Amino acid sequence: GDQRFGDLVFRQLAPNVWQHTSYLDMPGFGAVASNGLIVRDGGRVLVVDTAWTDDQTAQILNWIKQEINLPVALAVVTHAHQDKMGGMDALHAAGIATYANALSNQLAPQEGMVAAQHSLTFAANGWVEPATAPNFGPLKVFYPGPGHTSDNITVGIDGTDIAFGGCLIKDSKAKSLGNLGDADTEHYAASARAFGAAFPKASMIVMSHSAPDSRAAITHTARMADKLR
Ligand SMILES: [O-]
Ligand SMILES: [Zn+2]
Ligand SMILES: [Zn+2]
What is the domain range of residue 218? Predict the structure, then answer.
């Protein structure tokens, strides 16, 4: 069951995997939820995405201290929007090593974000170049192509049935793709399908702006994105 912890919500998804949820009251758009992940890998914790703010991200770290009580070895953030990178300073203040797509780090300042410390680069086929993601343990990072943004990346969790689509994927009941302000409308559908093809065994799809769903999230997202072309 959901655990309310201050203004955030935490939900266990699998034995070593939790979803974090934070909210930003965006005037004209309501209070928008954003989800990321927390993964225990043996004696350390790995984080996918910040919360919207530094204060909220510090609260994620407080929850981790309370409920897991192991060091956070690293965080990876999945593009240069506030829901994913807004809390970078809190991660740095805590001494956590941070990683993002090279392109996300390049875009960060202009998007009003602080860059991660380290840049991921990607092979032509989309898989992260392993030397740029040292000590990622079960996190398998994949660049599916431009979609929600040019820089969006995705993360599978080895040893689980879970893959994280970030803001690229919406659930199977969604009426729209959400914020397309920085989207690549021509390539979105193919990128959504490439995410699915990269993690073919994942039966639980986690995403930023919907609750976890089946792979119907991927097919429905791609089918909606077909209409953008
Ligand atoms: O976003
Ligand atoms: Zn975004
Ligand atoms: Zn988002």
Answer: 1-229
